[PDB]
From TrEMBL:
Residues of the full protein shown: 37 to 139 of 161
Family the entry assigns: Belongs to the bactofilin family.
Coiled-coil blocks: none
Domain of life of the source: Bacteria
Protein name: Bactofilin A
Lineage per the UniProt record: Bacteria, Pseudomonadati, Pseudomonadota, Alphaproteobacteria, Caulobacterales
Amino acid sequence: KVASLLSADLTIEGGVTGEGELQIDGVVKGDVRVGRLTVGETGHVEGSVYAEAVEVRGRVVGAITSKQVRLYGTSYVDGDITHEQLAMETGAFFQGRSLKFQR
């Protein structure tokens, strides 16, 4: 109960909550609340996601809010980013308005 798996034939609506690691290889339309978030291979995420840590392995365009973020895989990010700690790994391609935490 700490590694859920949402197929691709699944789509999020409005907003959903959860706990632990969330493996999703589908499309997200709305809000998302969870501890860890792994973006499957479908790489489809459109909305506002709020979490503590996330590992991208696909594409997520919209808005992200998390103190920890790591762009893994040929992932992509387009939108407003807000993170205190960030790490770029080979395959990270994001053109959006990024906001770095100064002080």
